[PDB]
Amino acid sequence: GFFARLKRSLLKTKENLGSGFISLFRGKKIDDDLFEELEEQLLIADVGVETTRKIITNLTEGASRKQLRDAEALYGLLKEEMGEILAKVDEPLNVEGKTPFVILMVGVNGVGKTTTIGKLARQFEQQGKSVMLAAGDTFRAAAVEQLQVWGQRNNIPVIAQHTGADSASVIFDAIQAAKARNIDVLIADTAGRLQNKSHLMEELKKIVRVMKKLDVEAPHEVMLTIDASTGQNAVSQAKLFHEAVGLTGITLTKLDGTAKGGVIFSVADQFGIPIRYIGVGERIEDLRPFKADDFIEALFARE
Amino acid sequence: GFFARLKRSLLKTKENLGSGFISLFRGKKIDDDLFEELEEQLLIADVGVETTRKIITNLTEGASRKQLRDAEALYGLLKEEMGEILAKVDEPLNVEGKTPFVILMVGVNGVGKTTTIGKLARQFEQQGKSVMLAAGDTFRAAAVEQLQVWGQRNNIPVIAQHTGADSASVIFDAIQAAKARNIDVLIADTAGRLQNKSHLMEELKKIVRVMKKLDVEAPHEVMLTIDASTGQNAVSQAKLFHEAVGLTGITLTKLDGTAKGGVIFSVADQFGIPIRYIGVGERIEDLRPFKADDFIEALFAR
Ligand SMILES: Nc1nc2c(ncn2[C@@H]2O[C@H](COP(=O)(O)OP(=O)(O)OP(=O)(O)O)[C@@H](OP(=O)(O)OP(=O)(O)O)[C@H]2O)c(=O)[nH]1
Ligand SMILES: Nc1nc2c(ncn2[C@@H]2O[C@H](COP(=O)(O)OP(=O)(O)OP(=O)(O)O)[C@@H](OP(=O)(O)OP(=O)(O)O)[C@H]2O)c(=O)[nH]1
């Protein structure tokens, strides 16, 4: 769905990756120099050191068994190698059948986490589910009020406490109120300060502990939001949160507005954590369920 | 396919748009007066305020960097500018490989929903797919009876219940019967009264929720049917349905018999929702897959 808009949103990434490789292979023979030029181009596009070597090695071996001499035929092999990486993390989120389904949202500030919560909320509401938000980012007084106003405007209940309250208590109350009110989906926001890395990770563990007192299956999803325009910073952030709490899903925002599109391959390859959604714009449908076949087609389409 | 017929069917729109711009540019120089005359002509045709101002803006910018002086050289730039709007929403519906593929048809009464469902159902049958309909407009008994009669004539199963039944229950039963009978495509009609006591948007949300208890992928398509004759009312309807349920597709009916063909440009620019089908007549093949390149060629042909 919205395939054309996904192609348009990858325009800047497509200068270097996917269809941006056609110019490199044009009128050329398969020589080590092309593989070395291909290798710079992937590294420039933020595909990542380990992921690039795997692509170059698999491409090189792949073109040898198939006796290819023309560089243009590498395009097909490159498309399937990079689709293979993304296909391993294609697994859309299913939030049905729980009372409530609890989504704990983790990430650093500025990556677009609250924006992501808002769009998910609206999308779930469009499907006939009731939704409830927990303002677990308790020390940022402004953000908490922004969120409550947004709930008012959108008829979505937002559970909150005074500034500086315990994050686990707020989220504890939200689960109580959500079970009482027959909510299908609870989404909890969290703090995004990694300045003291030990403090946030310990806070997030306290939240999960408290949640398990109420439902031993909660959180049903631990989801990370990372920003594709921060390059390898997203890779690093994913590593910290995965080790500390155990991510079950990733949302990658802002693929529009960046020539750094390779980062999706790097997070897909290093971690194998299902990528649930990609953000490609400011519309609610811009938060799209990630499908690897469509992404690869949009990226490699020959405009 | 049927390009000649698509052209004839646009003939009333072509007086103002496309080939109807040839007269405005004939023997004229590029000046503010021409751009102002072009702007009003687009507005008279229902192209839309925002969309017309994007057209006039790029078209002014493009003619300056290229240093154009003759007005009849704007025809080519205008063709391209308008074809770019429509190319962003060119994306045909593909209903293959599901068991069943579920289409949810939404829209207000009178726009052509039931006719659209009938032609789609026939076209899918011609392609060797099996089709089933759900009569989800429960309160309208005469429509429920006519759809059942249409099914018997066309050998297409129709799932219905008693007058006033729960639409979400009718839809639930149709998805179960489609699964038991290996149906490839299930098309669900819905109520179309925007009166508040009807509670249509809540009714539509309940349908989608019931669908997900049986297949979390359903509905595979949420398609709005709107009418080109309604002018901006079609844009207003698109906004109401899109905010409430989320549209994945748009069928624009009744391009024939209207000089307001600008609505297709307005809907395309404002929403970016793919236009799966265009209705240009009373025949089965007059519900056509929308292809932007052909549409622009027929609109701008001499
Ligand atoms: N282009 C694009 N932008 C996105 C996307 N997702 C989020 N953003 C932007 O990311 C910025 C930060 O969003 P938040 O959700 O507030 O970020 P977080 O800090 O993670 O949340 P927090 O509130 O701290 O929990 C906002 O821009 P500002 O509010 O700063 O700008 P503008 O003023 O122009 O709207 C969003 O518009 C996306 O998919 N595409
Ligand atoms: N010219 C043209 N007409 C179309 C097209 N699509 C639909 N129509 C007509 O628009 C009218 C709407 O018919 P319906 O399908 O009942 O529309 P909706 O009311 O939206 O469906 P609903 O039944 O409420 O779900 C019908 O004419 P009447 O109701 O007057 O006929 P008559 O009344 O004699 O049939 C159709 O023939 C089209 O592409 N081109």
Author numbering:
A (entry chain B): 194 to 496
B (entry chain A): 194 to 495
From the manuscript:
The stringent response enables bacteria to respond to nutrient limitation and other stress conditions through production of the nucleotide-based second messengers ppGpp and pppGpp, collectively known as (p)ppGpp. Here, we report that (p)ppGpp inhibits the signal recognition particle (SRP)-dependent protein targeting pathway, which is essential for membrane protein biogenesis and protein secretion. More specifically, (p)ppGpp binds to the SRP GTPases Ffh and FtsY, and inhibits the formation of the SRP receptor-targeting complex, which is central for the coordinated binding of the translating ribosome to the SecYEG translocon.
We determined the crystal structures of the pppGpp-bound NG domains of (Ec)Ffh and (Ec)FtsY at resolutions of 2.5 and 2.4 Å, respectively, as well as the crystal structures of (Bs)Ffh and (Ec)Ffh in complex with ppGpp and Mg2+ at resolutions of 2.5 and 2.8 Å, respectively. Both phosphates are not coordinated or form any obvious contacts to the GTPases of Ffh and FtsY.
